[PDB]
Amino acid sequence: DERFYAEHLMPTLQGLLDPESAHRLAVRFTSLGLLPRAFQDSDMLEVRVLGHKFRNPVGIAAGFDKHGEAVDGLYKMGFGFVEIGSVTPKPQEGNPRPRVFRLPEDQAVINRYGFNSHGLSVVEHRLRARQQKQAKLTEDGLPLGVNLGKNKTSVDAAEDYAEGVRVLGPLADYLVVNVSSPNTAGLRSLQGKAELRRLLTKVLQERDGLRRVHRPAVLVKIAPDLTSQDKEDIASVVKELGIDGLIVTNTTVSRPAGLQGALRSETGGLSGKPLRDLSTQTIREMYALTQGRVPIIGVGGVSSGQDALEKIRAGASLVQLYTALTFWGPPVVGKVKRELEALLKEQGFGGVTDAIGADHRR
Ligand SMILES: O=C(O)C1=C(C(=O)Nc2c(F)c(F)c(-c3cccc(OC(F)(F)F)c3)c(F)c2F)C=CC1
Ligand SMILES: Cc1cc2nc3c(=O)[nH]c(=O)nc-3n(C[C@H](O)[C@H](O)[C@H](O)COP(=O)(O)O)c2cc1C
Ligand SMILES: O=C(O)c1cc(=O)[nH]c(=O)[nH]1
To answer: Can you list the alpha helix ranges (DSSP code H) found in 209-330?
Structure first.
């Protein structure tokens, strides 16, 4: 029940556990399938993109399952697709705790995990243990994405991503080159035109070298804090290299006027409601700059069917959410899907596909 989780369970749980502990428990419970029984996906929610079928367009954003420990439990939660990561080549602990903060009054979160990761090797074996099961899930419209990061002390960023492509690329439907984390020094500078072109050329060559059935689509995840110039350059490089898609957006280092949370000034990436429209507008811009020819996964502040549809109409073929789950719990997934379907009908769309980029055509 949506009300029970939102009004009693989640609030109570958050009053007993600090945010990081709550997240750990969340991963455990999800991996064990301890979830409230979930909404029947209708044909209207089906979407075909990135060379795959997605039974519904709502996925779990990177960061919740960083090490690929609860993939099956997440599909059970109702997500149309799952994205794990970010995963770094070698294992690393990330930043010291506390590194995640709740801003209840803003329905937001600020985190500075710093790419805490079990590493490629561990995640590789974890995914291989269910590789064939995933193959059937994917064929049944439930794709898997793998988000790649880089180690804090890496001297060659491009090689870190290349290694991720070689090790986890064969186990993913799509790979995400995450160059938008605000918690790794100098990482976002990789979004620059020159560095991005060099980086992505290497990533794509590595990807193309994989055997056909193990060749994933490659997407780039960008920040919501890019200048107009940065966006023009990214769009240019994407079209030049044939990048398969974009994930828009990661968390923001900005602090919108109006934040009420006592922890609003903590260093880190802000997620949730305060990021919603900044992300939607970034999706709108990237869609236009790419002439609607580059698939976009919209992410940032999605907690309702309306939030999802606004991003879809802005140009997103798929959407993801994370923060909303931390406030409303598992039931939010079914809620978003139910509201989205109803809105699609009310607005005269035959299905999700018909609504993609609709705002640009009116
Ligand atoms: O809650 C938090 O403060 C934060 C996070 C979080 O993962 N929160 C969740 C949580 F604490 C849970 F218990 C969740 C779950 C996960 C699965 C089942 C659940 O129902 C229960 F507890 F009754 F079993 C609740 C969940 F999905 C979260 F996102 C991530 C950053 C901060
Ligand atoms: C606690 C936390 C950890 C995250 N970790 C990652 C990560 O490792 N890689 C990544 O690409 N994004 C990461 N993100 C960002 C989310 O994938 C997403 O882009 C962003 O939070 C906006 O969506 P939301 O408002 O629904 O949370 C993280 C977000 C949070 C809140
Ligand atoms: O691990 C992290 O701190 C992190 C990575 C990322 O891409 N985004 C985010 O908000 N946090």
So the answer is: 228-241, 276-289, 305-314, 323-328
Pairing relationship of beta strands 318-321 and 296-299 according to DSSP bridges: parallel
User: Selecting from 2.40.30.160, 3.40.190.10, 3.20.20.70, 3.10.150.10, what CATH number does the domain 1-362 have?
Assistant: 3.20.20.70
Q: What approach was used to elucidate this structure?
A: X-ray
Q: Whose CA is nearest to atom 24 of ligand 2?
A: 300
Give the Cα separation of 174 and 146 in Å (integer). Answer: 6
Please indicate whether residue 269, judged by its CB atom, sits closer than 6 Å to ligand 1: no
Pocket of ligand 3, beta carbon within 6 A:
63, 86, 111-115, 178, 180-181, 183, 250-251, 269
Q: Contact 355/347 with Cβ under 8 angstroms?
A: yes
What amino acid occupies position 307?
D
User: b vs e for 63-79, b when ≥16 Cβ sit within 10 Å of the residue's Cβ?
Assistant: bbbbbbbbbbbbbebbb
Give the closest residue (by CA) to ligand 1 atom 5: 23
Mutate which of 325, 327, 333, 336 for ligand 1? The one with the most ligand atoms within 8 Å of its CB, which is: 325
Instruction: Specify the residue for token string 């491009």.
Output: 158
- Residue 345 is given by DSSP the state H
Q: What is the resolution of this structure in A?
A: 2.0
